[PDB]
A paper describes a structure:
U1 snRNP, the most abundant snRNP in most eukaryotes, is critical for the initial recognition of 5ʹ-splice site (ss) through the base pairing between a single-stranded region at the 5ʹ-end of U1 snRNA and the 5ʹ-ss. Specifically, while purified human U1 snRNP (~250 kD) contains only ten proteins (seven Sm proteins, U1-70K, U1A, U1C), purified yeast U1 snRNP (~800 kD) contains seven additional stably associated proteins (Luc7, Nam8, Prp39, Prp40, Prp42, Snu56, and Snu71). Here, we report the structure of yeast U1 snRNP at 3.6 Å resolution determined by cryo electron microscopy (cryoEM). The modeled yeast U1 snRNP has a dimension of ~200 × 120 × 80 Å with the overall shape resembling a foot in three dimensions.
Most secondary structural elements are well defined and a large percentage of amino-acid side chains and RNA bases are identifiable. We built atomic models for almost all essential domains of U1 snRNA (excluding the 5ʹ-end 10 nt of 5ʹ-ss recognition sequence and ~230 nt non-essential region) and partial or complete models for 15 of the 17 proteins. The U1 core (Sm ring, U1-70K, U1C, U1A, and U1 snRNA) is located in the “ball-and-toes” region while all modeled auxiliary U1 snRNP proteins are located in the “arch-and-heel” region. The yeast U1 snRNA structure overlaps with its human counterpart in the LR1, LR2, SL1, and Sm-binding site regions, while the SL2, SL3, and 3ʹ-tail regions are drastically different between the two RNAs. Our yeast U1 snRNP structure demonstrates that the core components common between yeast and human are organized almost identically, in spite of the dramatically larger yeast U1 snRNP. Although the yeast SL2 and SL3 regions are almost three and 15 times the size of their human counterparts, SL2 forms a 90° bend in the middle and SL3 is largely peripheral, enabling the U1 core proteins to bind at similar spatial positions as their human counterparts. Prp42 (544 residues) is a central component of yeast U1 snRNP that interacts with all visible auxiliary proteins, and connects them to the U1 core in the “ball-and-toes” region. In addition to interacting with all visible auxiliary proteins (Prp39, Nam8, Snu56, Luc7), Prp42 interacts extensively with the U1C-CTD. The C-terminal TPR domains of Prp42 and Prp39 interact extensively, both using the face made of helix A, to form a heterodimer-like structure (left). The C-terminal half of Nam8 (the linker between RRM2 and RRM3, RRM3, and the C-terminal tail) can be modeled into the cryoEM density and is nestled between the Prp42/Prp39 paralogs. Snu56, therefore, acts like a “clamp” which uses its C-terminal helix and KH domains to clamp the RRM3 domain of Nam8 onto Prp42.
Residue numbers in the entry:
A (entry chain Q): 2 to 76
B (entry chain A): 1 to 91, 94 to 188
C (entry chain B): 3 to 134, 153 to 196
D (entry chain K): 3 to 64, 72 to 133
E (entry chain M): 13 to 108
F (entry chain N): 5 to 96
G (entry chain L): 1 to 119
Write the structure that this text describes.
RNA sequence: UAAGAUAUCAGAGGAAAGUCCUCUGAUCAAACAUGCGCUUCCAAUAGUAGAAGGACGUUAAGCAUUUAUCAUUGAACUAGUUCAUUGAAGUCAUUGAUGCAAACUCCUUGGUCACACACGGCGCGGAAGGCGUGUUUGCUGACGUUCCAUUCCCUUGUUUCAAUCAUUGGUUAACUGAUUUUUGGGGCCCUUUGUUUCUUCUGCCUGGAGAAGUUUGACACCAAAUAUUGGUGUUAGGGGAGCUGGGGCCUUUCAAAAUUUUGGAAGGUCUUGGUAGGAACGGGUGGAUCUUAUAAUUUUUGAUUUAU
């Protein structure tokens, strides 16, 4: 029905938790009414900060049925 | 509280004091990652289709779907409705009762009062040219006036001027009912 | 249709933004501020009028309380009680708005006072208050020696009015 | 204990202290105040009650006593997706006769406000 | 679309579509096997079905197997008349 | 529906959450929409195994909320009045 | 068609709602909602024992059974009796309806006939 | 977010098929009344108690358990162990957490009613259901428009006895019963805690009082900025007359059927409810419900029985 208002968030670095355990940080470009979201320069965070962390791709789009939370780690 | 980023002033904002933080309690259900419905669903096996015969011999005749026969009663009744209509469509060049002069001279008049007469019908329709014939139609099964008549004028231009005038004029009032006019149709 | 039941009025032109112009409108804010101020006092002012359950007293306790003398009760007049409830209600308003902040007054010229007590410019709260001067740059170069006709004496300890005549009448030493 | 009306839906039993079950096996017990199309509900002074993992061997089939660890959380708004069933616990503080009395005095008082508002809006 | 238009569409998809397997199983009195997402299978005869795939069944024979450390048992539970919610099912076969 | 209309009544007051993953957030609630999804500001976030942190700004899909705890003084806001007398509307 | 409109006519019957958990609920049925929210009366909700030499039963449902406040202390086997249980629709897996009632009277939906009789 | 709808069924009627509309049946529902030898519950005072529920209370560092990071490099070492250095993350807690049990303290609830201290009911209530008849209505509520509507009295500690006073009735001035006024005596309550908590004003424990008022109104309270405006709430309880609804019973009158049953009218008696709003009509009116868009990520057409 209504579009989720993340208008203030876009172009900032954003951590979000995919389903349960996986955490994905990137720079948020765009969003839609289902909360499927797309972001640039993604990186999958893990327990060891430089070691297990690996980059995903140039552009990646996430389905909104696996967003739980979406914290804005910038201003 | 100190900051209170709210529409209200500082007194009203301090008025909505929240109950203190929720105590932590170690969770009892399954973790959200591990959550799943039963996997390893063993498919409809050949061994299952081998054990069908124990069920099949036990209930060889299935029970009758009598709720379906309520639908087979109605749909077959609608087809029989068409056949009684098919008995009627085979039976207008025959009827004797519609078989005088040119069908371009014939007005249909309809919705006429049950309790009209041919003389009042003649008065009104003779308004639009000399009449060659009338007939009110009556139910041949028992002579209820059917509420229609056929009126043959000496000219089809007077039949179409009678049509003009006394049907598209809302329906000619004769006695107490609003009488459509058409051309013969039939 | 849509309406705001604090104001009791329907919206004239229904859009989404006309709602938001009414939702953060000055008239509407003053209503909803005032609406909860009334429901606040009404739970306290309408005090729980409890229901009594009277037991048939004993033969024993009726004789032990008969020998005990009847105490005098004190009932004030209607004019008297209308004033004393005006006072006691205005007193409980005061204990709401005390907020004993002597401790902020004591650490005024200290070396981190800008960063902890100014509270526009902490870390925890500081980002939130800038939305809704004495800056963070202040160091201990300005005002090197506090006592240079600058500081004010510590404001003396407060005391109860009712019992203002329990105080010892004379000081021990001669003040200036 | 308490006997609920044999045909009483969720709309009827406002103010009845309920006993709502979620999918995880946690129960919220409080006074109901609203509900909805998809059955999410507002309890007034609810308490979540959980059977901890250690106690749960005790409920397996053999007077049992269960240490139920509960935590207060006043005035929640639950979600529908999570509810599994409901059961009634207590009946409301006010009578059935007295809940009609408070309705008719409030129905009278609500009407008096509008006519006093309409005539204060009409002339001024 | 109109309300009458959907009534035509529903009669089509039941008659000339994937659910025609169920509809042709109801009319011809042929028993079906159903697999629920429970991981246990019921051998039954259909008496009605619907859009959501829920269905009223008759002479139901459920067949449920369980295991605990590689020890198996095959349990059989008989029911006269049953009403099955439609989300539970994953695969319906029609017996020969 | 009142359950959702209440959540709009709680803007700019401290609330709690409990996401269906089993976390617990509690900070001041800035935004809410009709699908019960919320933006909290200046929060304290408690992971399901007890670990607590602080984060400035957070958004949550409404679908994962298990309950919200609201300040207790809204228990008598006027959503809950049974017999209400609205005036006659103005003509459009 | 809605086959939930069949359940609405099955009112005042003995029934067994059998849930997604594995919890069976034997009781007297009342008004079923359009979303299948069945609401019962004189109920007895239980868990079966999957035998197999002490295989552990549904851990979540045993908690939810005791929490209802219907389980009596000297219930040796795992049952819980109470009055009035309102049950959210999506949780229903099966409904074991009784042997006595005739389907043929009840499976004739009225809106099914009222579409054909009107045309 | 939208559209549509306001019980279903069957029969007769009005404008061969169907729709629209109307009165007659059945079933369904709601509200209101009103019954059932209906079901369950409603706490010592002839005593210092006790029942249900709590305590996010104490004893208590109780008792009994089990827990406190990983990687890299060197030394010693048995053939794992300790020490030191470098990196990674790191809820708080160890007076903890987990299991077991008791004692004490304290909180909220109610008919702490009337009669009786008497060798498997049929006292007056209130609370909660189940079941049955009857009436109204067929979603419900404001609002407007024409109409029908149309009352009073006493009391606000209570009860009981005595004294007198007045009024009314029975009988032969006297007696008896009922009711009211002034005093006195006794009983219980005053937490009514802002000393009757329907307002306002006067006022009180050697007393229970006096004055004014009651809904297009009055009163209380809250909020301001320099009196006004905007908000929340109060306007009660008890008894009697009247007036009217419902229930059972009695006698009379009438109709049908074979002295009786069924229905209708009136009078009498018992019991119970209401007592200031109600009817029609009208709207680009509110809310509820229902059907369909809607089984396609944000609730209800399955990723929580931890399973191979």
């Amino acid at each position: 029905v209504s579009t989720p208002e993340l208008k203030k968030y876009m172009d900032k670095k954003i951590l979000l938790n995919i389903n349960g355990s996986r955490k994905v940080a990137g720079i948020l470009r765009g969003y839609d009414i289902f909360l499927n979201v797309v972001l640039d320069d993604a990186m999958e965070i893990n327990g060891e900060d430089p070691a297990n962390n690996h980059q995903l791709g140039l552009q990646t789009v996430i389905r909104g049925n696996s967003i739980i939370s979406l914290e804005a780690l910038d201003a | 509280m100190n900051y209170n980023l709210s529409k209200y002033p500082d007194d009203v904002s301090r008025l909505f004091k929240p109950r203190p933080p929720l105590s932590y309690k170690r969770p009892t259900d399954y973790p959200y990652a591990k959550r799943q419905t039963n996997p390893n669903i063993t498919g409809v096996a050949n061994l299952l289709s081998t054990s069908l015969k124990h069920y099949m011999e036990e209930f060889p005749e299935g029970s009758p779907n009598n709720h379906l026969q309520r639908y087979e009663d109605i749909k077959l009744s609608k087809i029989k409705n068409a056949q009684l209509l098919d008995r009627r469509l085979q039976n207008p060049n025959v009827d004797p009762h519609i078989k005088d002069t040119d069908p371009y001279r014939t007005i249909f008049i309809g919705r006429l009062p049950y309790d009209l007469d041919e003389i009042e019908l003649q008065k009104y329709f003779v308004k639009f040219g000399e009449i060659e014939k009338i007939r009110i139609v009556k139910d041949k099964i028992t002579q209820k006036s059917k509420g229609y008549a056929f009126i043959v004028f000496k000219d089809p231009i007077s039949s179409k001027m009678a049509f003009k005038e006394i049907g598209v004029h809302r329906g000619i009032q004769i006695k107490d009912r609003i009488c459509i006019v058409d051309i013969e149709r039939g | 249709r849509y309406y705001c039941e604090y104001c009791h009025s329907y919206l004239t032109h229904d859009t989404l933004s006309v709602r938001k112009s009414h939702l953060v409108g000055k008239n509407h804010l003053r209503i909803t501020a005032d609406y909860y101020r009334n429901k606040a006092r009404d739970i306290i002012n309408k005090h729980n009028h409890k229901r009594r359950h009277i037991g048939k007293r004993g033969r024993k306790e009726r004789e032990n309380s008969s020998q005990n003398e009847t105490l005098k009760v004190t009932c004030l007049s209607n004019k008297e009680k209308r004033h004393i409830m005006h006072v006691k209600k205005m007193n409980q308003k005061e204990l709401a708005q005390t907020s004993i902040d002597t401790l902020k007054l004591l650490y005024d010229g200290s070396p981190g006072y800008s960063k902890v007590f100014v509270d526009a410019n902490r870390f925890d709260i500081g980002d939130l208050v800038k939305a809704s001067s004495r800056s963070r740059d202040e160091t201990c170069e300005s005002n090197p020696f506090p006592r240079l006709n600058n500081p004010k004496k510590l404001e003396p300890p407060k005391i109860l009015s009712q019992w203002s005549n329990t105080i010892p009448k004379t000081s021990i030493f001669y003040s200036v | 204990k308490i006997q609920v009306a044999h045909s009483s839906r969720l709309a009827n039993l406002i103010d009845y202290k309920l006993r709502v079950l979620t999918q995880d096996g946690r129960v919220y017990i409080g006074q109901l105040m609203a509900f909805d199309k998809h059955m999410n509900l507002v309890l007034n002074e609810c308490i979540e009650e959980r059977v901890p993992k250690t106690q749960l061997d005790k409920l397996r089939p053999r007077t049992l006593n269960i240490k139920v660890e509960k935590r207060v959380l006043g005035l929640t708004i639950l979600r529908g997706e999570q509810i599994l069933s409901t059961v009634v616990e207590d009946k409301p503080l006010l009578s059935k006769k007295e809940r009609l009395v408070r309705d008719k005095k409030e129905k009278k008082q609500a009407q008096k406000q509008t006519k006093l508002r309409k005539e204060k809006e009409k002339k001024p | 679309l109109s309300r009458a238009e959907l009534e035509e569409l529903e009669e089509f998809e039941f008659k000339h579509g994937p659910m025609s397997l169920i509809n042709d199983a109801m009319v011809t009195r042929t028993p079906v096997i159903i697999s629920l997402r429970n991981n246990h299978k019921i051998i039954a005869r259909v008496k009605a079905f619907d859009r959501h795939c829920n269905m009223v069944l008759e002479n139901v024979k459920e067949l449920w197997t369980e295991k605990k450390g590689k020890n198996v048992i095959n349990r059989e539970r008989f029911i006269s008349k049953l009403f099955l919610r439609g989300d539970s099912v994953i695969v319906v076969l029609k017996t020969p | 529906g009142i359950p959702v209309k209440l959540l709009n009544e709680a803007q700019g007051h401290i609330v709690s959450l409990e996401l269906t993953t089993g976390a617990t957030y509690r900070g001041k609630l800035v935004e809410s929409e009709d699908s019960m999804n919320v933006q909290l500001r200046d929060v304290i976030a408690t992971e399901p195994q007890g670990a607590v942190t602080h984060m400035d700004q957070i958004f949550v899909r409404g679908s994962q909320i298990k309950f919200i705890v609201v300040p207790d003084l809204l228990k008598n806001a006027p959503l809950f009045k049974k017999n209400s007398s609205r005036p006659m509307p103005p003509i459009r | 068609m809605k086959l939930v409109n069949f359940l609405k006519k099955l009112r005042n019957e003995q029934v067994t709602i059998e849930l997604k958990n594995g919890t069976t609920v034997w009781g007297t049925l009342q008004s079923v909602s359009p979303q299948m929210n069945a609401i019962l009366t004189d109920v007895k909700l239980t868990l079966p024992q999957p035998r197999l030499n002490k295989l552990n039963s549904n851990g979540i449902a045993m908690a939810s059974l005791y929490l209802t406040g219907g389980q009596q202390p000297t219930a040796s086997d795992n049952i819980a009796s109470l009055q009035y249980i309102n049950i959210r629709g999506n949780t229903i897996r099966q409904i074991i309806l009784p042997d006595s009632l005739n389907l043929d009277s009840l499976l004739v939906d009225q809106k099914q006939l009222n579409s054909l009789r009107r045309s």
